[PDB]
Amino acid sequence: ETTALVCDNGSGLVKAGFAGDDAPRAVFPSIVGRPRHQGVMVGMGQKDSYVGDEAQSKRGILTLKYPIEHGIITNWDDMEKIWHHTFYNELRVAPEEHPTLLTEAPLNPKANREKMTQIMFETFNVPAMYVAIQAVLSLYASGRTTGIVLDSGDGVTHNVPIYEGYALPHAIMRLDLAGRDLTDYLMKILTERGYSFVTTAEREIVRDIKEKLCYVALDFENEMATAASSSSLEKSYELPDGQVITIGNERFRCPETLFQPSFIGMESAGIHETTYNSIMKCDIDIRKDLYANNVLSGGTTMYPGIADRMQKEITALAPSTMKIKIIAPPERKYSVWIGGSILASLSTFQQMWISKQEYDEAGPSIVHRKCF
C-alpha cells in the first residue's frame, strides 16, 4: 500500500513522518532563517535560506520567520521552504511517491486550503492528498468517533464538538491565544520583573522556559497568594551564557491569560467558557457523548496539573448531571499527527484521497468537494 506522509502544520513545531507508525519521525522547529548580512561566511559557502534545526543552529546570523502565525499560513514562501526541507532533508524521500495528509484549524481560510492544494500538486507533484481538522485526528487517536476536543496548539485554541467523525459546523468555537502569544506575553511580564528581554533570540530561550517551567495552577488566587507570601513558587533557570535568572509567578500567570483573555486586552471569553458555550450549541442526546469525552490536545495542553483545573472549571459552568471527565492522552502533543497516522492507514479511508486527475479537472477547488 502507498506510504502516506502525515505532516502536522504546527505553528511553532513541525511534526512529520510516515503513516502506520505510532509516533512522528521528525520533530523540528517551524522556523525559516534568512541572512541579516551577507559576507558573514567567507572561505565557506553561504546559503540564504535555512530551515528547521539547520536554521536553529545559525539563529545568531539569521532572521527567523514563522511560516504559520496563529494557525494561519502567513507566507506561502516560508510554507514551501518547510515543505521542501521536510521531504528532501528530513525524511530524505521523493514526495511524488507518497500521498500527503495535511492538518488544519476549523474555519481555516478557503483561499488558503486552495493555495495549499495547488502548491502541493504543482511543485511537489504529489500523487494524491487530503486535508483534515486537527481535533478530528486527536479524537481518532483517543479511539473515539464522538467527543469534544479542546485543541490548544503553538498559536491557536479551538473547542471542537465532533460526532460520528464529523465536526459540528454550527457549534465549534475559536480563540487566537495559545503558544505563540504565550511566549510574547511571557517576555513582556519578565521585562516587568526587571529581566528585560528585547532580542528575539533571547525570546526563543523564553519559549523554551515557558515549555519547561509553566504549570497550570488549580487555584489562581491561592497560588498567587502563595507567591506573594513566600518565594516558594519560583524556579531558577541558568541561561546558556551563564547568569542564573529566577522565574517567579510568571509561571502560572503566563498561561492564566487562557482563562482570562482580558489580561491582554481582548473581548474574548476563556477556554473553559468556550468549551461550555460550544457544547450548549449541540442537541441533548449528543451532549451526553460530547460531555462524556472532553479531550485535551496540542502543545499548550502539556503544562502539568491542567486536568484538575479544567475538571473544576467545566463542572462549575456545566450542570452536575452531565458526567464531567477530562481525557488527557499520554502524549497529547502528537495526537493530531497520531490520528493522521491512524486515519491514513485505515483501509476504509483509501477511497477519500484527492487524486491528481481530479485536481487537473477542477483546479485547487477539489478540497471543498473531497474534505468536510
Binding site: 462524556a292 458526567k323 471527565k325 481525557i327 499520554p330 502524549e331
Partner: protein, 60 residues
C-alpha cells in the same frame, strides 16, 4: 604531554559512557511512559464503565 593526553582520553571515555547512560535513561523513560500509557488506558476504560454503572444503577 602525557597529562594532557590522559585527561583527554578519560574525558572521551567518560563522554562515551555518558552517551550510553543517556540512551539507557531515554529507554527507561520510554518503558515507564509505556507502562504509564497501559495503566492509564485501563483506568480510563474502567472509569467510563463505572460512570455508566453509577447511572444504570440510578436509572434502575
Amino acid at each position: 604531554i602525557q597529562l594532557v593526553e590522559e585527561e583527554l582520553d578519560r574525558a572521551q571515555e567518560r563522554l562515551a559512557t555518558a552517551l550510553q547512560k543517556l540512551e539507557e535513561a531515554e529507554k527507561a523513560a520510554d518503558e515507564s511512559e509505556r507502562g504509564m500509557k497501559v495503566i492509564e488506558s485501563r483506568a480510563q476504560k474502567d472509569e467510563e464503565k463505572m460512570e455508566i454503572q453509577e447511572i444504570q444503577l440510578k436509572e434502575a
